[PDB]
UniProtKB/Swiss-Prot annotation:
Changing residue 60 to N: In Malmo-95/Dalakarlia. Ca(2+) 1 binds at residues 3, 228, 233, 236. Disulfide bonds join 50-59, 72-76, 108-153, 152-161, 184-230, 229-237, 249-263, 262-273, 300-345, 344-353, 376-422, 421-432, 445-461, 460-471, 498-543, 542-551. The lineage of its organism: Eukaryota, Metazoa, Chordata, Craniata, Vertebrata. PANTHER family: ALBUMIN, SERUM ALBUMIN-RELATED. This is Albumin. Changing residue 112 to R: In Komagome-2. Residues 1-170, 171-363, 364-561 form the Albumin domain. Glycans are attached at residues 9, 48, 121, 146, 183, 209, 217, 260, 265, 297, 301-302, 307, 335, 362, 397, 423, 428, 478, 509, 518, 520, 529, 557. Ca(2+) 2 binds at residues 10, 239, 243. Belongs to the ALB/AFP/VDB family. It comes from Homo sapiens (Human). The modification Phosphoserine is found at residues 2, 55, 62, 257, 403, 473.
């Protein structure tokens, strides 16, 4: 009886307005801002009228009916739910302007003036450029953003205060968005059972003491919340997240030993602290699992008595006991335990078919461990950027047909796993690294689905979720790729490079590295580094030059032609 009233009371007006703004921006993206504010301001004024009597105007419409109708103020021609669907139009790289951040006081001025116009714009600008951003999490970033301007716009050194805060949020925000973009992709492209299994593994790691009935409780709730979020039901998502959080904090001695740290915090901070909480220590001693999963004459019938459940806490039992395994690995191990029993009890004698099942795991366990140890050592000597450059040539040769911008971003995010995970002890490195790889590889997956150009990317992306990273790291040089036409002002460089500093300077160099590798796809690592290093000395001293742009121009093609050859 009026859903708009129901969510307006549960969420309250501020989270209400912020959420529908986010919903509108994630559905329109290209539409301007004070249009969306009109539309959300109107939607909220009608809602107040609905709480005042839930049997009033068209207060009975569904949220999608209401919100979809408001937006249509183009292909709006269909009825609910299928209008909602046509959601299938969310642009994952809309080519709106890049988000330009001014300096530490023309932003302070606009914030100190009309400050929550300033904050509705922050929401709108993230929302439209991250159309799957976990919406209640975005309220939390908004709150942290606000606290950053509150406290440092009045500090003595405002830039010494705000900028290291505005930048940590940018890093958290990019990581958040990518995290959520994978949770949606699984639900939307591989179904809820894919998402359930991942949820089982992750929560089983993190609440090792919980019994299976509790984690499965938690899993269905978390599946409910992210299903709603990934399908536009932003208000219901926010409400159920907040319910799940209070439910978690009540039943606290029943799940884990360190939620208490944050079950005492305001809603947004609380649910954000949950979802990032440390795993608590697993029980002191716990049996092997061969006793219950391979040796017992109970299990082939059990795999026929409770297929998904029995799989479910084999997963729960292996995960609970292996915080050092990535989620993808745990998932790989259990889906190959499943494959095993799918055709073994199908044979004459079930048990002698499966004795395999725990030793089959070791090379599946070996290979990621080998990879991370290996890729860390390279990072541990190259450092980020040089590492990034190694991955650049590697992945560019792998999929030379993909967009150069995509290659560049995907590869430096790949390089970022070095500086995040290798600082960890090797018992902690593996979930850290392979699950972060999974997120970054999904970014390349969805970016590629838009303007597909390489079917080997398509194959790994569409084939599996859990098998993306091994599928990807198993490819090498295309051999089928015809070297791209040589264009000389794919290089050149202009003197603007000297002002556009540190990081964007690396982006430009790394871009040139990509279309260098695209042009000479068979050319040694040593050679590509040879020529890239001469770029880094060519930019450095041309920047320290009184060129009149000239340095870059004439020592340009003299290091464009001379650095051709290879």
């Amino acid at each position: 009886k009026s859903e708009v009233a129901h969510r307006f009371k549960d969420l309250g007006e501020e989270n209400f307005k912020a959420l529908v703004l986010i919903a509108f921006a994630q559905y329109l993206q290209q539409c301007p801002f004070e249009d969306h504010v009109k539309l959300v301001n109107e939607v909220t004024e009608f809602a107040k009228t609905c709480v005042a009597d839930e049997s009033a105007e068209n207060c009975d419409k569904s949220l999608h009916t209401l919100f979809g109708d408001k937006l249509c103020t183009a292909d709006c021609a269909k009825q609910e739910p299928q209008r909602n669907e046509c959601l299938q139009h969310k642009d994952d790289n809309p080519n709106l302007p890049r988000l330009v951040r001014p300096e530490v006081d023309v932003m302070c001025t606009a914030f100190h003036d009309n400050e929550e116009t300033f904050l509705k714009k922050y929401l709108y600008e993230i929302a439209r450029r991250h159309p799957y951003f976990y919406a209640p999490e975005l309220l939390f970033f908004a709150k942290r953003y606000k606290a950053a301007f509150t406290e440092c716009c009045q500090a003595a050194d405002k830039a010494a205060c705000l900028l290291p805060k505005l930048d940590e949020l940018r890093d958290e925000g990019k990581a958040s968005s990518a995290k959520q973009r994978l949770k949606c992709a699984s639900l939307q492209k591989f179904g809820e059972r894919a998402f359930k299994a991942w949820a089982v593994a992750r929560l089983s790691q993190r609440f090792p003491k919980a019994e299976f009935a509790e984690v499965s409780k938690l899993v269905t709730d978390l599946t409910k919340v992210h299903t709603e979020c990934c399908h536009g039901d932003l208000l219901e998502c926010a409400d159920d997240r907040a319910d799940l959080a209070k439910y978690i904090c009540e039943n606290q001695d029943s799940i884990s030993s360190k939620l208490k740290e944050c079950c005492e915090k305001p809603l947004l901070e609380k649910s954000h602290c949950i979802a990032e909480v440390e795993n608590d220590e697993m029980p002191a001693d716990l049996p092997s699992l061969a006793a219950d999963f391979v040796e017992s004459k109970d299990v082939c019938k059990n795999y026929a008595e409770a297929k998904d459940v029995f799989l479910g806490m084999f997963l729960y039992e292996y995960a609970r006991r292996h915080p050092d395994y990535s989620v993808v690995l745990l998932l790989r191990l259990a889906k190959t335990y499943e494959t095993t029993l799918e055709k073994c009890c199908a044979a004459a004698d079930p048990h002698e078919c499966y004795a395999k099942v725990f030793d089959e795991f070791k090379p599946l366990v070996e290979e990621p461990q080998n990879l991370i140890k290996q890729n860390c050592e390279l990072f541990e000597q190259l450092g980020e950027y040089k590492f990034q450059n190694a991955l650049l040539v590697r992945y560019t040769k792998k999929v030379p047909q993909v967009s150069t911008p995509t290659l560049v971003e995907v590869s430096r995010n790949l390089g970022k796993v070095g500086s995040k995970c290798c600082k960890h002890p090797e018992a902690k490195r593996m979930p850290c690294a392979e699950d972060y790889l999974s997120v970054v590889l999904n970014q390349l997956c969805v970016l590629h689905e838009k303007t597909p150009v390489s079917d080997r990317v398509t194959k790994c992306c569409t084939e599996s979720l859990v098998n993306r990273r091994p599928c990807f790291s198993a490819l090498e040089v295309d051999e089928t790729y015809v070297p791209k036409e040589f264009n000389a002002e794919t290089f050149t460089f202009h003197a603007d490079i000297c002002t556009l500093s540190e990081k964007e300077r690396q982006i430009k160099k790394q871009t040139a590295l990509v279309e260098l590798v695209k042009h000479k796809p068979k050319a040694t690592k040593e050679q590509l580094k040879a020529v890239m290093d001469d770029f880094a000395a060519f930019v450095e001293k041309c920047c320290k030059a009184d060129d009149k742009e000239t340095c870059f121009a004439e020592e340009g093609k003299k290091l464009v032609a001379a650095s051709q050859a290879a």
